[model samples]
Target: SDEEILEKLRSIVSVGDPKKKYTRFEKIGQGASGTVYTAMDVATGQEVAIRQMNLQQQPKKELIINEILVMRENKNPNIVNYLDSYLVGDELWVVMEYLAGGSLTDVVTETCMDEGQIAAVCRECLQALEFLHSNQVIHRDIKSDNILLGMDGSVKLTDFGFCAQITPEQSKRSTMVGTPYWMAPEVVTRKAYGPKVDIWSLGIMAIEMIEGEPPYLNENPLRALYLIATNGTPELQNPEKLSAIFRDFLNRCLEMDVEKRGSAKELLQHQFLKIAKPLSSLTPLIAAAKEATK
Candidate 1:
């Protein structure tokens, strides 16, 4: 029976194709959904990132469908490019553009970014968020870990595991899902929230860039959740250490009232973002981070 099942799976999906060959080199990332591998497409001579996940049961099916839908719908420069996908041997393989510069979390841990560089990254992420919101998609998880950088200094958003689609008729979502440190008040309280939740996370990310960590990094996980739900708003340990303009930008995003919090589009127009450096300016930083990793 096992052999027959294997035969059926092979017949259903062909893993070997003469036109293209994927040679997995190393495990690049891992998460609750799956593990990512850096691979080389021998036929095309291009590097790619491959995500592999086992298809367990019904719930995973929804995750796979959502991932595919988001990947297919959002095709902007600020988002990771999805190239191909396949189902084989009870596992799903998703191929995406390989980013050599690694995640923003890596960069922040290895090197400190200036205000201008931080603004540049924020601008790029906001552009991607605006695109997703316009398409009725919400990136329920927004954190430094999901932001990636390319060798050419291009910043893109990745990890659509928690991304959700909102129909025109129902734009609000009430799911309490996301990292506790970055979760918005509305999300922590399980209130109906929209794209503005991402703006709140983006504000937290800004603090991460400056402080090398998000607020409540030392607190216990459950305590952090409780604090976020009950506390008014978290602020930088030393807000005066940062620029006034940047402080104002964080204030706009950290608004406890979702109605008053600035949208991605509005935040993109802030004076602090106006001074952001060009994307190309990050090349040296990316190079340095890559070098440090080696």
Candidate 2:
């Protein structure tokens, strides 16, 4: 069975060593664009997460180029590291650092996370968002699914498919994109928006860790959109479950008016985040081989 899986994976790529020479071991994840597989490179003895994306989206060259550029330019530890890329057959393959711990959304699906842990993850995400925003880029899609966890207690922000550069003066986005549940008020209203939209989405995600769902999930998508634009009610029903400082931070982030939402820089200065800063200090996870060597 193991050999069968490997054979199937090998069929996906060309024969011989992959660009990075990783041997496919197991399938990991799948999405609209591609499938992710866990692979081990025999030469380096390192595991990798290889994403094989369909080239059918090539009609939107700008989208593909932007995604690659975002990965290439981002060097933050809180962001997934892009290792190598190559084309095989009619698809594009991207290799990234493998994170064995699944997505943050999947981790918190059953119940609420510890308030401290949730705040810590939120802080790390804001730090990443600050870096992207300062560089004039907006992570248009910020959701729990895009946040990956590492075995070493690190949080990584993945998926740059919707990221794009923006000018401070330019505020309107004609495209109605991004997951609706995490969208900000202005976004739901379809008004000219900016980086603050992501702040709102992150706020929703933070609460979802505890609420088990977003604030505006309704049976009908249109009704949810209407509630988000007009009501501006977050699904955070029990404030006692979270720290006071963290609760306030979430409030500011989820502000209905785009102009009123705090920027990532401002959020970094929040008291709750300041207290949780130490958890974000990075330490690499050691492989069994490395540990044995030590």
Candidate 3:
């Protein structure tokens, strides 16, 4: 049965996607484990990006399957949806709704966003986090690259390779993993971490949205990490340019003590997110973007 499943998966690509022969357009991204290609499904005339994960590491097979399970079970507007998954020889194929637009990292490289746009992105991400946290899932990795934008100027959270179910032993996370720049103080200091770490990362992302970079950047990565671990709340150079309400929101998010930081629920009601029209409009964008990707 396992062999049959594998053979079936191999046929999808070998027979050239019987439903649609997607012309391999270009390689959009590459990581240690796999490559991502921007392709067009000729049958449906739809563009999709395909990620091929390296299966050379047999020990990591379960990890891949688990990630697929999580994505399959998760049905939320602010999160990406998983369409299909299969195996091709030693490699694994994960078919997903392709996002033509890139990520927040790509957007910021072009130009820093204004307060409204910044709040818009943050609110959408917070909403997604609220859903994930409510379901007891922890997105261990929260970075600009993982927050994919849509053609409609909306954002959805993707990439579940490092995500995990939040177990009851809230302090037992000894696996030190996360982007260095966005790592929370507790995480950098090697203290016990939990879902609160996600809030800290978001706070860093909030500052980065307006300033174009994280607050702590040093010649040495370790030094930058030390600064984050011991330094006070990161202060932006031009707070006056940003709305006072937004600044207050950042402060709450950047609180060094994780216990004091606001949860995603509280953040949804903050003054920064209280701007009614934007929130309402963005909610639909999130839902539509998710549907489009699916």
Q: What is the TM-score ranking, best to worst?
A: 1, 2, 3
Which residue window of length 10 is worst by lDDT in model 2? 281-290
Report lDDT (Cα) of residue 16, candidate 3.
Answer: 36
Tens-place lDDT per residue, model 2, 41-112, is 778877889888666544554565567677888779889898877655545777888876666766556444
Candidate models: Cα lDDT each: 0.83, 0.73, 0.72
For model 1, residues 60-166, the per-residue Cα lDDT tens digits are 45555666767877899999998877666567677889998888887887788999999999999999999998888899889998998998888999878788889
* C-alpha lDDT (0 to 100) for residue 128 of candidate 3: 93
Q: Which ten residues in a row have the lowest lDDT in candidate 1?
A: 5-14
Q: TM-score of each candidate? A: 0.90, 0.83, 0.83
| Cand. 3 Cα-lDDT | 0.72
Q: Which stretches of candidate 2 lie over 4 Å from their true place?
A: 1-20, 57-61, 168-172, 277-294
- lDDT of candidate 3 over 119-182, digit per residue (tens): 8888899999999888887887888878887766667898888777866766346566687778
